[PDB]
Amino acid sequence: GSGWESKTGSCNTGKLACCDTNKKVQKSTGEESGLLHTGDVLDQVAIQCTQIPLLIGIAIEDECKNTPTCCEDVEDDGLVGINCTPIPLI
């Protein structure tokens, strides 16, 4: 449990990002947790993501005015979220 508060249980990896589900990226690897991803998943969805200067301990959905997602992995400084599913507000 580090990075973002996932106490809601909405995320399975703990990688919460503010992603656009309308904007997407042509590059899609995610080699942080998914060091070897190519032999497991090729359907990985890479949506364009952006995290407005975060405060520590703060909630992703309140920190930014975008969609809070749970990425299985994220590329770059968090610009490309791999398999980021929009986490519920519940």
Automatic annotation (TrEMBL):
Transmembrane segments: none annotated. GO terms for cellular component: fungal-type cell wall. Belongs to the fungal hydrophobin family. The keyword Protease does not apply. This is Hydrophobin. Keywords: Cell wall, Disulfide bond, Secreted, Signal. One of its GO terms (molecular function) is structural constituent of cell wall. Its main location: secreted. It is found in: Secreted, Cell wall. It comes from Wallemia ichthyophaga (strain EXF-994 / CBS 113033). Disulfide bonds join C11-C70, C18-C64, C19-C49, C71-C84. The lineage of its organism: Eukaryota, Fungi, Dikarya, Basidiomycota, Wallemiomycotina. It comes from the Eukaryota.
